[PDB]
Design a protein around this ligand. Structure first.
Ligand SMILES: O=C(O)CCC(=O)C(=O)O
Ligand SMILES: [Fe+3]
Length: 258
């Protein structure tokens, strides 16, 4: 029945994360915090407008707002939430910074599944080691509301079985061509309640269901990068125009997790 905090997080949960590449941590945010953070995200959606992850209006996987935490004063306290970010730190076992966050919405009956990938491939960064994502549920997410699934142990893939980095979208390859054994790997669906968080490593292969429920799904994805991460040109780097290749990502836009 009780909250999970950075302090009371079990050694078993940390071991599960290190071995499996993901972990479900329940009850990190209270009902009150969920309500306040969801409302702030709704304000950002209204003010910024959403973007489509997918191939146009008829092939929406996810509606999103990128660098989302920067776009509302109250969202700083989400990405640097003491429990969420403190748990991320314990799981990673190394110093972290906030890279970015996204508002991640799936509308009911109008979404495709989120196509399988690892996050490393689309991060415009060098020097990744312990980088991981906190996928924070701001609504309940039973399976059919667009829940996440993960391939256990896939973060430990050898180099030849990983794509690593896309400089441009022409480099896209089907995961089965990159990782021939992909289709014979188990796939774990992890439904969650609002306020729960699932963390996954930047090499963990993952995906999400279509939302075929009657209710909107909203999560908030926070990418916590290695604290000494540097800039590497790639797809998804439009907001990093002020940087040169190899420059460290530091300062107020990429704050240290303490
Ligand atoms: O919310 C989704 O459907 C996709 C999430 C995702 O890929 C991530 O958090 O890395
Ligand atoms: Fe992802």
């Amino acid at each position: 029945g009780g909250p999970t905090t950075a302090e009371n997080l079990s050694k078993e949960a940390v071991r599960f994360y290190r071995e499996q590449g993901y972990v479900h941590i329940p009850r990190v945010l209270s009902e009150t915090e969920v309500t306040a953070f969801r409302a702030a995200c709704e304000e950002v959606l209204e003010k910024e407008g959403r973007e489509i992850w997918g191939a146009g209006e008829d092939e929406v996987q996810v509606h999103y707002v990128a660098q989302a935490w920067q776009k509302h004063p109250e969202l700083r306290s989400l990405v640097l939430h003491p429990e969420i970010s403190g748990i991320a730190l314990r799981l990673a076992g190394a110093p972290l910074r906030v890279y970015s966050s996204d508002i991640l919405v799936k509308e009911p009956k109008r979404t495709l599944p989120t196509l399988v990938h690892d996050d490393e491939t689309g991060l415009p960064l060098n020097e990744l080691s312990a980088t991981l994502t906190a996928w924070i549920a701001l609504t309940d997410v039973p399976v059919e509301r667009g829940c996440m699934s993960y391939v256990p142990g896939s973060h430990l893939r050898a180099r030849e079985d990983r794509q690593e980095h896309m400089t441009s979208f022409a480099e896209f390859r089907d995961l089965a061509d990159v990782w021939p054994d992909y289709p014979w790997q188990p796939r774990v669906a992890v439904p969650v309640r609002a306020g729960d968080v699932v963390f996954h490593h930047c090499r963990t292969v993952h995906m999400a269901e279509a939302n075929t429920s009657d209710s909107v799904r909203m999560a908030h994805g926070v990418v916590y990068m290695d604290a000494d991460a540097t800039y590497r040109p790639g797809v998804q780097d439009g907001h990093l125009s002020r940087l040169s290749p190899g420059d460290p990502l530091e300062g107020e836009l990429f704050p240290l997790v303490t």
